[PDB]
Design a protein around this nucleic acid. Structure first.
Lengths: 140, 190, 70, 68, 38, 145, 102
RNA sequence: GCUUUUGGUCGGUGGAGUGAUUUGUUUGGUUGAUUCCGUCAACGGACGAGAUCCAAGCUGCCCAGUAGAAUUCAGAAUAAUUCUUCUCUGCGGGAUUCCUUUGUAAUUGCACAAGGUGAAAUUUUGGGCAACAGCAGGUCUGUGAUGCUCCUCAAUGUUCUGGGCGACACGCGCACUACAAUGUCAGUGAGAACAAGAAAAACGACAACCUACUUGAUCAAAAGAGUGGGGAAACCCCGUCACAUAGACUCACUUGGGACCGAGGAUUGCAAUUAUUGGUCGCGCAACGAGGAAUGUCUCGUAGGCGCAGCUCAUCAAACUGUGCCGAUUACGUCCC
């Protein structure tokens, strides 16, 4: 009774571990959902649980391994690992219908997980400063 | 709905909302959201800007003039304080006030150079729906940095003070004063 | 989006020389390309396979330059 | 009140030197049992516009670009 | 730090990875196995 | 079913509840000179007051979660912009200095030593009251104050 | 003596042209071999201004390498490895390997 | 380097012209494209474009003892097992204008759009490359790369040659950069989290590179010293931010400039008379308080903000080269400049 899954944003990697129980609450990358410090990320990382099925669906014991990004991209890395993590189960341990209900309710929500929304910083180039910004002219 | 569909700023009411003005009504964001900070490819395309909650749009448009700025998360803090001050000033859903504060802010009509090749010439030109959206939020929060620059005894209130007023239509708001003074440059020229 | 004369030309040699490629499927009409054609790159076949299906489909509309042995 | 809310029927074209304003044919938005259309009065809009835009006109019944 | 191909001790020479090729430039001196990509 | 941090939000809590327990208990150790700045490039006086009073349980919750560390690794928790820096770009560096003395405190008093972390780990138990006993008007439930 | 192989060479079809091919001298023969994958690739990146002179459009080169490491693992044949590596002649710039551990 | 960011250039035979020259290389439609189709006194060919390349994104196969997860068993606080989700990489899949829209345009065509599928949706993305003609463009300070013709021994040669300069104070005029004056971190004191490309070493001798640990610590800081493995998959705690921690400021040139400043002291090393600095701590009362005309460069993980290594390097980054974090409003346009 398990699956496993991975979140990704930019470089940030979340990995969703999966264990089963119906009473339980999730740690942050290392620390429980409730207590993650920037409120304004929490209610986001609530969205995985709260939005769509809040309670009727998943209390499952879940831990996440998040490395490779700064703080916020690690909050987006996370939730995806959950929505991915959750959708994994109802394919393995449940019927298409219970799945089809959930992932639709995601699809309407946004690309909560359709994908990492792949965007990586542009390589700095030439004498160009940072990227696309040029060393500035004078006496032009 | 047991906090499933419905949304909360932290705990707040996004359902009863609509815009008043049939002009820009029915395209402006009517919120279902929690936090104004979301990340997606916000405007890949041409008119995509009208989808996402003004709450973002403000929080997004929230802090120009970057110097050591944290933007979205620093913004959302300020909007925790901003909305709360506002509703229990105005006794309304500040989701309404802000929604009601967008419309009265921007000029419905403008005067541009249509002059050809260095000639400065006039025409009355008629503003477009996304420009009352856009310029409102832009100038709306421009009143902040001004009212907020030095003389403040007022930490967040500046933002509260030009959202409150505009939602009242008052001419004191740096928001609306340009809605009229542009139209002294509009109906005058035409 | 616009195809170079190289895509254009070679794809006219295929349709001239292969009626194995029939279905409007880009995917079927592709897998017949790469075995039969060596362009040394994928995009060429991906281009070629895209235009090769334009030709066939349009043949059903009427005649097309490089007319068939029919 | 002054709000008379019309539709863009179409973008009658780009107009003007910079790329900014755009000629538009406006269908007065208000509908009444005696439907008052213009039917159409050409307008110039400031900023980006699109196929179904609601354009409330504060200075109504002006005949637009004509001259220049 | 006079360097490898010439008297130089100028045209400041790369220490990077201790190959000292700048004397006759790492452009003229090549076959090192470097390539021009990106 | 209670672990170090992890149940707590030890940000300003699992420290501070340990702090009073460190200060009010006469047991622990505060060396003499406090007049000197703890922290990277700070001309501000080392704090308003209570200088070691932020310091010690860091080193403990530094020990606990990060297992093995030291003088070199633990200042990774001591943070600074290193910005006094004069008309140049600022840069960033940590403090090796009070480290040794800081960790000597735990070299006494029931917390393991010249290699590891702790002995009995009071931290859980002495911290086991946080969800029980709140400072801030901790909400908990209507049963617990 | 489980032995170890580190093949470090740049050039195209060397790092491959030994380990892939030339371990099947041991791979399919009396030896029993433990293949892992090649370690990660490196690039050695120098960038020098293109101008011998001062004048420029401020332009720079970027020159690169790739060094390709492969680890390939064994049980212990005695004296066979001396025969193993020596079976197969084909490559250049590729690396011979003498390793013991555990 | 630049003309030169664009899409341009050249020839053979043929045609027109006494000829220089011209046609091919075009009206029109479309495209970033002399890119296409159509038309065509031109026909068939060469370059440039494209395409090959390189990195980034989703993905297959192989693979892990110099990658890291699952589980049971026992132990503190209420060590055995199997694997490839995560990482490694060579070679492969994938993208194409593919359906749809009676759409725009249009009997053809070449195509465009809004939409669909998908990690990616229109040269997918960022680059490298790049014709033909030229420029009295820069380099004789890169080079046994070179023509002259000056020097040739109290030398314009050479000196681990000695000392000095290249860097000086008329607030002089100018280019680029770093600092910043706020109550939007705002200043600072603590506290919580988390990142990535990159480097690391010595021979004609009997270790000179980094970094982790813990002493220096009964008394500053930076220092000193001893132990420990790394030839590189020895390392992962970077600041921005998060903090209401009930912290301190508090209608001000100021609990914000760090300049100028004289006293000690640690450090690299032939020598520092400011080399330099989490080094102290005095000067703050030096400007300074959104910047006159004028001027810069870019459109999506982008500007901006932040910061980290690398390169020079015995010592020193406000420089450049590259990596990553935070992450924007405006146009999806015109030719007016």
């Amino acid at each position: 009774k398990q699956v496993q899954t991975f979140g990704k944003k930019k470089t940030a990697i979340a990995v969703a571990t999966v264990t089963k129980a119906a009473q339980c609450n999730i740690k942050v990358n290392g620390v429980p959902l409730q207590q993650i410090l920037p409120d304004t990320l929490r209610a986001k990382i609530m969205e995985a649980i709260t939005v769509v099925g809040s309670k009727y669906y998943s209390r499952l014991r879940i831990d996440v391994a998040v490395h490779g990004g700064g703080q916020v991209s690690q909050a987006y890395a996370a939730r995806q690992a959950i929505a991915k993590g959750l959708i994994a189960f109802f394919q393995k341990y449940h019927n298409e219908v219970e799945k089809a209900a959930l992932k639709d309710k995601f699809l309407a929500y946004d690309k909560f997980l359709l994908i990492a929304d792949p965007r990586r910083c542009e390589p700095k180039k030439w004498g160009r400063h940072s990227a696309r910004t040029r060393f500035t002219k004078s006496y032009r | 709905m047991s906090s499933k569909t419905p949304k909360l700023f932290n705990k707040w009411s996004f359902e009863g909302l609509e815009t008043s003005e049939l002009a820009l009504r029915d395209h402006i964001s009517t919120t279902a959201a929690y936090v104004p900070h979301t990340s997606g490819r916000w405007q890949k395309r041409r008119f995509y800007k009208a989808r996402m909650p003004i709450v973002e749009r403000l929080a997004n448009g929230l802090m120009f003039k970057g110097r050591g700025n944290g933007r979205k998360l620093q913004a959302a803090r300020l909007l925790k304080h901003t909305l709360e001050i506002i509703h229990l000033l105005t006794d309304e859903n500040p989701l309404q006030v802000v929604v009601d504060a967008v419309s009265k802010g921007a000029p419905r009509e403008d005067s541009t150079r249509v002059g050809s090749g260095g000639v400065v010439r006039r025409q009355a030109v008629d503003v477009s729906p996304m420009r009352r959206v856009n310029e409102a939020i832009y100038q709306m929060c421009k009143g902040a940095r001004e009212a907020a620059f030095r003389n403040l005894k007022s930490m967040p209130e500046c933002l509260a003070d030009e959202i409150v007023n505009a939602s009242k239509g008052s001419s004191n708001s740096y928001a609306i004063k340009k809605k009229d003074e542009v139209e002294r440059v509009a109906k005058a020229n035409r | 989006k616009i195809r170079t004369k190289t895509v254009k030309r070679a794809s006219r040699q295929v349709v001239e020389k292969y009626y194995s490629k029939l279905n409007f499927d880009f995917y079927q009409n592709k897998r017949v390309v790469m075995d039969v054609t060596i362009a040394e790159s994928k995009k060429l076949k991906n281009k070629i396979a895209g235009y090769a299906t334009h030709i066939m489909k349009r043949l059903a509309r009427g005649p097309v330059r490089g007319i068939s042995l029919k | 009140d002054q709000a008379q809310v019309g539709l863009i029927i179409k973008v009658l074209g780009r107009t003007g030197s910079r790329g900014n304003v755009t000629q538009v044919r406006v269908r007065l938005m208000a509908e009444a049992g005696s439907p008052d259309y213009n039917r159409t009065i050409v307008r110039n809009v400031k900023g980006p516009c699109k196929e179904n835009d609601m354009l409330s006109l504060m200075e109504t019944e002006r005949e637009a670009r004509r001259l220049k | 730090r006079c360097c490898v191909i010439c008297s130089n001790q100028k045209a400041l020479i790369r220490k990077y990875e201790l190959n000292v090729c700048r004397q006759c430039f790492r452009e003229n001196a090549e076959h090192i196995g470097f390539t021009k990509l990106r | 079913k209670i672990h170090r941090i992890g149940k707590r939000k030890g940000a300003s809590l699992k420290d501070v509840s340990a702090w009073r327990w460190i200060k009010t208990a006469a047991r622990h150790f505060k060396q003499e000179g406090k007049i000197f700045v703890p922290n990277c490039t700070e001309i501000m006086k080392s704090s308003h007051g209570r200088e070691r009073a932020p310091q010690n349980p860091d080193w403990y919750y530094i020990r606990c979660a990060a297992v093995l560390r030291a003088i070199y690794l633990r200042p990774g928790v001591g943070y600074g912009g290193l910005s006094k820096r004069f008309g140049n770009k600022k840069n960033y560096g940590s403090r090796p200095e009070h480290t040794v003395t800081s960790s000597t405190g735990p070299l006494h008093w029931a917390c393991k030593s010249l290699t590891k972390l702790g002995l009995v780990e009071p931290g859980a138990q002495s911290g086991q009251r946080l969800t029980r006993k709140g400072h801030k008007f901790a909400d908990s439930l209507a049963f617990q104050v | 003596q489980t032995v170890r192989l580190t093949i470090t060479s740049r050039n195209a079809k060397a790092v491959e042209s030994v380990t892939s091919q030339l371990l099947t001298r041991a791979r399919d023969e009396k030896v029993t071999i433990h293949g892992p994958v090649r370690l990660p690739t490196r690039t050695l990146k120098i960038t020098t201004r293109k101008t011998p002179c001062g004048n420029g459009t401020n332009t720079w080169d970027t020159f690169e390498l790739k060094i390709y490491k492969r680890i390939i693992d064994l049980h212990a044949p005695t004296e066979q490895v001396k025969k193993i590596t020596s079976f197969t002649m084909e490559s250049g710039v590729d690396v011979s390997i003498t390793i013991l551990d555990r």
